[PDB]
Design a protein around this nucleic acid. Structure first.
Ligand SMILES: [Mg+2]
Ligand SMILES: [Mg+2]
Ligand SMILES: [Mg+2]
Ligand SMILES: [Mg+2]
Ligand SMILES: [Mg+2]
Ligand SMILES: [Mg+2]
Ligand SMILES: [Mg+2]
Ligand SMILES: [Mg+2]
Ligand SMILES: [Mg+2]
Ligand SMILES: [Mg+2]
Ligand SMILES: [Mg+2]
Ligand SMILES: [Mg+2]
Ligand SMILES: [Mg+2]
Ligand SMILES: [Mg+2]
Ligand SMILES: [Mg+2]
Ligand SMILES: [Mg+2]
Ligand SMILES: [Mg+2]
Ligand SMILES: [Mg+2]
Ligand SMILES: [Mg+2]
Ligand SMILES: [Mg+2]
Ligand SMILES: [Mg+2]
Ligand SMILES: [Mg+2]
Ligand SMILES: [Mg+2]
Ligand SMILES: [Mg+2]
Ligand SMILES: [Mg+2]
Ligand SMILES: [Mg+2]
Ligand SMILES: [Mg+2]
Ligand SMILES: [Mg+2]
Ligand SMILES: [Mg+2]
Ligand SMILES: [Mg+2]
Ligand SMILES: [Mg+2]
Ligand SMILES: [Mg+2]
Lengths: 116, 328, 81, 208, 132
RNA sequence: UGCCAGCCACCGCGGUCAUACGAUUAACCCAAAUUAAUAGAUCCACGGCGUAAAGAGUGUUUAAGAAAAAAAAUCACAAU
RNA sequence: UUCGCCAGAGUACUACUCGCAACUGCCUAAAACUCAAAGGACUUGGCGGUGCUUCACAUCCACCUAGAGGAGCCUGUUCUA
RNA sequence: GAACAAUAGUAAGCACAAUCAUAGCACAUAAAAACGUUAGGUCAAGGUGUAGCUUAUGGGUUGGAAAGAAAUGGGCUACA
């Protein structure tokens, strides 16, 4: 259910005092907005820290710990593959919804009437 | 502009008669092919652009197609779609859609009579069939079109062909077919050659970067290579070049079995090695099986190397390198 | 006009421009149409198939009938002299 | 780019073309290769069908080359491989049966192993934040790492030798010292690793 | 912007000859050479002489037939004789045209010490390739 | 002549091609008058008050006015 | 139906008055003088150390290679002459 | 002054594009690139408007044009 609009805006007829002051008029627009691209954060940081502990302990000889090196590598590979392959599928599939282009077209087929 | 076309055809025929007379040929057996040679010889214009050179041709080919008159003398437009502004295109769309509906009806009656008697003619792919381009369609309706227009129409033809195809339907969609010409990249095998009681020698010619190379290979010989009358170890002191010469033979495992003579000119040492490489490769294609030819091509043995020195450009230094740019 | 609207639900341009051009206009105006600029409006349903098929058939027959009557009366006028 | 994007890179491998009949998906694949009427770039002069050429040795050769001299750089590489070889043949005959079982005489395997040991795990990128440039730990691609190894080798055995000393000498030295992990190159690798631990907190500034 | 030998686009009314509608980069591609002579070929001599001669001929002809010159001159030189060929507007009575033909041919023949031919082609109005 | 000298009711003019200054030629307009200066005559709102000048921070009454036809005072919630 | 207000802009939520538990106060509220505008809304640009998307292919960052900036010369500027 | 499951735009022309060149394609490169912007550059290429000189601001002859306190640009050769 949509929040009530009755009595809310400041109008010549309205008895009471405003509840909303809308910054820009509340009229459904004929297009939607474009999806905000996800803010990235560092990847692999945990495996990095584990490897760094392994080094600090074993005095930075690489032969000593081959597991944490190899696993940090494995992880960086999974973050590269992630960056490449996730871009396209996140840019197409919205799951249950439609890509904003299709939504815009659909909304131009049945637009809002402010006028008349 | 109709009187024009009539006149132009009159004078093209009178003229073709005249021309045939001076060139001293039979006016009946005179072709366009002959008209061309005749002008080319009479009005010899070197100009690089071929469209700017002298032309005498049948006015139908010279002049562009004309939209015919669209209405009678009373003002009533002949075609019922006239007011659309594109009659040609929307008629096409109309009849196409009509044939689609027709197909749907007929095939539904045949669904109720327990008959699917048709087949899918939609695979012409071995014929190398494609749709018309927008340009072609635009020429067939004598009318300008839009990209979305062309798109619409094509999509509709697709809808059509995706159903059971009638005879008149197949014939209909096939005006809009073209066939893409021959696609095969298979090479042309040099016929093997037998010379002066000597058996089995083949020839090939490489070109790389200012170096030309002609290589004759004998199948009947042992392994050695004579380049410009000397041994290949002497002519190509650098290992890298000897390896280049080795590449195609080692690839075909012919390394001991053939005996070659070469003439290479121009370029430096590496360019000559490259040239002989290519030529040798092209010569050994006579001796080998048709499959290994495809292999050599897929190893990049048979393609000339297009990379060549670029021209220095005025106001720069090196054909790319720029004179030092001072900001302030 | 068999439908006075365009697929974006505003009035079809041709209405304003036929008016603009002094051309008289017949049209089937559904319940949500604006009849004002239409010379002879006929209120009724434009959306359902038997309706549109009906109106098509009617205007068809009227036209054909008229063109006939004109042919026949022309023939009569030709035999008059 | 005297080749249109239409042109595929050639596959030089002989083994691939010689023994096709046992693989379905690859038969289908190179079927689609040639039958696509696909254009092929002409095989480069550097690369050969030779059973003897190591792409890593060739890369290194190239990174050593100054000006246009392949002849000179291929010389120096050849001489260096020969020098490692003879240095290990020297170390072999002055040794005892145990160490004669242990010591490696293949200069190729020595080259490779010495590079694998010298390649960095982690790296540093400068990142500007709040008007300051922090050095931040960054995971590296494989190629970047191999590159860093080779470039560090060559930079050291160009820079730090005494002018009397020739290149294949110093290079064979450093190859063998990096084989056993005690080389200055390896110390550089460690300086990087330590600078990367010192800054590990800053690993948060990396947004990718 | 290159300006050389160009006729700039006006409001779209401007009549333009086939010659004037083609910028220098089209020479030998679309339009051809307004002169022909041996001098500029590889192993040949006295290019300079023929150039000056040319310049004087264009100037001279332009002044001798005021207002009636349609397009720039065509100068063909063959085995010591020069055939000048011109496009001329019909302005003068054929009396004046023949007077000037004869006058010119003789005058220039005695000036340049070689036989000079003059060929007039007559045109109603400047032939128009473009705009207009 | 050259942002000088000067001009103008208002807008503005004069920086080297000034119909705007100064003089000449031509013209225009008034005319025994013609310009300038100053006073008048005339001229503001029966118009307006969200954003331009203007609804007075709030309510009650006084004085003064309007009543011009039909009815009403009153129930969840954070008055004081 | 009423009432309260408003007669260019500045000067000016100011100067003088009256009143006020206010004493650097509130209220009320001019003129000389200066200007030929001052204002209101919009329009198209341009711009924005504004936000959101998309990019840069020798190109900004990340990165690669060779140089310049230091030396001697060569040649051009600026000065000084 | 657009929306193509189309809502007011058609438009010739010039640019872009295409073609031409680099001796076969292709690619690359070359060439091309309108209208305008910077009162950008050039009265010393030549030509010219306006304004200036005319026994000179014109035409000739002979000889002189130096130079490095300093600052700097671009190059060459290097430092092996
Ligand atoms: Mg209340
Ligand atoms: Mg607001
Ligand atoms: Mg260079
Ligand atoms: Mg309806
Ligand atoms: Mg005056
Ligand atoms: Mg004056
Ligand atoms: Mg005046
Ligand atoms: Mg005056
Ligand atoms: Mg009087
Ligand atoms: Mg106000
Ligand atoms: Mg209020
Ligand atoms: Mg107040
Ligand atoms: Mg007023
Ligand atoms: Mg005032
Ligand atoms: Mg206050
Ligand atoms: Mg006060
Ligand atoms: Mg007072
Ligand atoms: Mg750069
Ligand atoms: Mg240098
Ligand atoms: Mg330097
Ligand atoms: Mg320097
Ligand atoms: Mg100077
Ligand atoms: Mg147009
Ligand atoms: Mg070409
Ligand atoms: Mg191209
Ligand atoms: Mg260019
Ligand atoms: Mg172009
Ligand atoms: Mg200037
Ligand atoms: Mg200047
Ligand atoms: Mg001058
Ligand atoms: Mg200097
Ligand atoms: Mg320079």
């Amino acid at each position: 259910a949509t929040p009530s609009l009755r009595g809310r805006l400041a109008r010549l007829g309205n008895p009471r005092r405003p509840i909303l002051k809308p910054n820009k008029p509340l009229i459904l627009a004929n297009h939607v907005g474009e999806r905000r691209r996800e803010k990235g954060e560092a990847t692999c940081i945990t495996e990095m820290s584990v490897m760094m502990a392994c080094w600090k302990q074993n005095e930075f000889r690489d032969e000593a710990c081959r597991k944490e090196i190899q696993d940090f590598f494995d992880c960086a590979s999974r973050a590269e593959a992630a960056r490449k392959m996730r871009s396209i599928q996140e840019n197409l599939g919205e799951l249950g919804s439609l890509p904003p282009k299709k939504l815009n077209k659909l909304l131009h087929r049945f637009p809002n009437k402010p006028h008349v | 502009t109709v009187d024009f076309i009539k006149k132009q055809i009159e004078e093209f025929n009178i003229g073709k008669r005249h021309l045939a007379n001076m060139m001293g040929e039979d006016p009946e057996t005179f072709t366009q092919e002959d008209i061309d040679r005749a002008i080319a010889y009479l009005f010899p214009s070197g100009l690089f652009e071929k469209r700017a050179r002298p032309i005498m041709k049948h006015p139908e080919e010279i002049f562009p197609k004309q939209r015919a008159i669209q209405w009678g003398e009373d003002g009533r437009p002949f075609h019922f779609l006239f007011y659309t502004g594109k009659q040609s295109y929307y008629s096409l769309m109309h009849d196409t859609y009509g044939k689609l509906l027709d197909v749907e009806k007929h095939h539904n009656q045949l669904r109720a009579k327990d008959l699917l008697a048709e087949k899918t003619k939609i695979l012409k792919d071995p014929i190398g069939s494609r749709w018309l381009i927008k340009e072609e369609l635009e020429e067939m309706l004598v009318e300008k079109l839009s990209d979305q227009d062309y798109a619409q129409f094509i999509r509709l033809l697709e809808r059509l062909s995706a159903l059971p195809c009638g005879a008149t339907e197949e014939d209909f969609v096939n005006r809009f077919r073209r066939s893409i010409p021959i696609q095969s990249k298979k090479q042309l095998i040099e016929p093997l050659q037998y010379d002066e009681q000597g058996m089995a020698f083949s020839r090939g010619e490489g070109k790389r970067k200012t170096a030309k190379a002609e290589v004759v290979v004998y199948g009947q010989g042992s392994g050695r290579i004579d380049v410009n009358g000397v041994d290949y170890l002497l002519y190509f002191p650098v290992t890298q070049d000897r390896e280049q010469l080795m590449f195609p033979l080692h690839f075909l495992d012919r390394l001991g079995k053939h005996d070659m003579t070469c003439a290479v000119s121009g370029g430096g040492r590496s360019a000559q090695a490259g040239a002989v490489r290519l030529a040798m490769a092209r010569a050994l294609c006579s001796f080998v099986t048709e499959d290994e030819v495809e292999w050599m091509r897929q190893a990049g043995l048979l393609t000339a190397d297009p990379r060549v020195r670029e021209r220095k450009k005025p106001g720069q230094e090196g054909a790319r390198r720029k004179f030092t740019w001072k900001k302030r | 006009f068999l439908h006075t609207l365009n697929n974006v639900f505003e009035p079809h341009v041709a209405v304003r421009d036929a008016a603009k051009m002094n051309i008289p206009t017949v049209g089937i105006v559904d319940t949500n149409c604006n009849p004002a600029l239409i010379t002879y409006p006929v209120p009724g349903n434009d959306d359902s198939p038997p309706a549109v098929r009906l109106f098509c058939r009617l205007f068809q027959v009227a036209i054909s009938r008229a063109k006939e009557k004109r042919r026949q009366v022309e023939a009569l006028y030709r035999l008059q002299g | 780019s005297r080749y249109g994007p239409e042109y595929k890179d050639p596959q030089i491998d002989k083994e691939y073309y010689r023994k096709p009949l046992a693989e379905q998906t690859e038969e289908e694949k190179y079927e689609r290769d040639f039958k696509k009427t696909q254009l092929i770039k002409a095989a480069p002069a550097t690369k050969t069908s030779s059973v003897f050429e190591d792409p890593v040795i060739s890369k290194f050769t190239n990174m050593m080359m100054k000006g246009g001299n392949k002849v000179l750089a291929r010389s120096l590489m050849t001489q260096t491989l020969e020098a490692v070889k003879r240095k290990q043949f020297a170390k072999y005959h002055a040794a005892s049966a145990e160490e004669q079982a242990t010591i490696e005489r293949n200069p190729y395997t020595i080259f490779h192993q010495a590079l694998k040991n010298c390649e960095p795990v982690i790296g540093l990128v400068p990142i500007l934040k709040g008007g300051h440039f922090y050095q931040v730990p960054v995971p590296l691609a494989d190629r970047r790492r191999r590159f860093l190894a080779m470039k560090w080798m060559i930079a050291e055995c160009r820079e730090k030798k005494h002018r009397r000393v020739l290149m294949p000498e110093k290079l064979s030295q450093e190859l063998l010292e990096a084989f056993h992990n005690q080389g200055p190159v390896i110390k550089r690798k460690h300086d990087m690793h330590k600078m990367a631990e010192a800054n590990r907190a800053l690993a948060h500034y990396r947004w990718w | 912007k290159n300006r050389a030998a160009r006729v700039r686009v006006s409001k779209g009314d401007k009549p333009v000859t086939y010659e004037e509608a083609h910028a220098p980069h089209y020479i030998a591609h679309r339009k051809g050479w307004l002169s022909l002579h041996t001098g500029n070929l590889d192993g040949e001599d006295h290019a300079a002489e023929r150039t000056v001669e040319d310049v004087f001929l264009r100037k001279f002809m332009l002044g001798t037939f005021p207002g009636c010159l349609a397009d720039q001159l065509v100068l063909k030189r063959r085995a010591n004789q020069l055939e000048i060929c011109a496009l001329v507007l019909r302005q003068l009575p054929p009396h004046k045209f023949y007077f000037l033909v004869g006058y010119s041919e003789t005058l220039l023949s005695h000036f340049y010490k070689c036989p000079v031919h003059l060929h007039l082609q007559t045109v109603p109005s400047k032939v128009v390739y473009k705009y207009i």
